[PDB]
């Protein structure tokens, strides 16, 4: 907790393989855990991300939920910040409906005084003429609720949540996300009771950069306890 007091720099690195298409994205920015603010920029190395940006919004930012403005009466239930100095491993499968599946594994830790993430992604049995492979997803990203429940056997937290993506035509694409968060450190981890984190995000594009800007300003608040 005392490490998050104030403003904390954040760096994220992901290397995904969508049906052979290998892409890498390295983003950076700032986060304020006290106010639950997260302002990041994820400029992918590839000129064009093989998949839409909203699809990887949940892989590049929701892998860092320790910045959520956990209420003081739920600060104990902040699993992420607990055992954070040692880091934690987040393995998540996203089943898109009729568009295939994402398999992702990320490691969240500190380097110096900066939060860092090592993420790896893979795409399986995709549909080329689907909403995602067709790039029909709208740039804007909706607000979503992420439900979290502690499992004692793995002394971790399993997370469930459905993500909705807006489409240019008008359809809403629903994806179901199964996630597991396991502690890397052997110290006492604060296993939380069931709670849902509300996440409200905005995507924008800066004028200057030729490469994809992927400006993301998000605010996360814990709730349900």
């Amino acid at each position, epitope marked *: 907790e005392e490490l998050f007091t104030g403003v904390v720099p954040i760096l994220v690195e992901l290397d995904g393989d969508v049906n052979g298409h290998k892409f890498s994205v390295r983003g950076e920015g700032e986060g304020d855990a006290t106010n639950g603010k997260l302002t990041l920029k994820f400029i992918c190395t590839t000129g064009k991300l093989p998949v839409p940006w909203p699809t990887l919004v949940t892989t590049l930012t929701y892998g860092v939920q320790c910045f959520s403005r956990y209420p003081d009466h739920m600060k104990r239930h902040d699993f992420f910040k607990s055992a954070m100095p040692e880091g934690y491993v987040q393995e998540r499968t996203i089943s898109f409906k009729d568009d295939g599946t994402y398999k992702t594994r990320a490691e969240v830790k500190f380097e110096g005084d900066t939060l860092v993430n090592r993420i790896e992604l893979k795409g399986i049995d995709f549909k080329e003429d689907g909403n995602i492979l067709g790039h029909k997803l709208e740039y804007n990203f909706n*607000s979503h609720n992420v439900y979290i429940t502690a499992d004692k056997q793995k002394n971790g937290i399993k997370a469930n949540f459905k993500i909705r993506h*807006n*489409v240019e035509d*008008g*359809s*809403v694409q629903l994806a179901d996300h199964y996630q597991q968060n396991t502690p890397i450190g052997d110290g006492p981890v604060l296993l939380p009771d069931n709670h849902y984190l509300s996440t409200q995000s905005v995507l*924008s594009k800066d004028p200057n950069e030729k490469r994809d800007h992927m400006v993301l300003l998000e605010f996360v608040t814990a709730a349900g306890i």
Partner: nanobody
Amino acid sequence: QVQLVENGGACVKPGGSLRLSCAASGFPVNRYSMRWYRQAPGKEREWVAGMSSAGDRSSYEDSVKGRFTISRDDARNTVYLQMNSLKPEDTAVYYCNVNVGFEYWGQGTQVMVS
């Protein structure tokens, strides 16, 4: 900044017709796409209808496919959605979703066939 007002929700016996009107503030309706979400009491929200930004292409769900209609009007700055024939599967609140940025949930209109 941006607010949404939904009206026209009313009770309808099967085979009737009802139109829900969603008026918008703080942004032009043409430049931005619109959607309608359906939420039953105590169940998960489900999308029903949607208009693209240009308004040329519209999409519907399979359950009410061909039985729902959706349209837009810029002079009045308001979108409309027509139920056409009603079935007891339409008993859910109808929220109007459009965000220029962020997420903006409309108040919605509560409709049910009964």
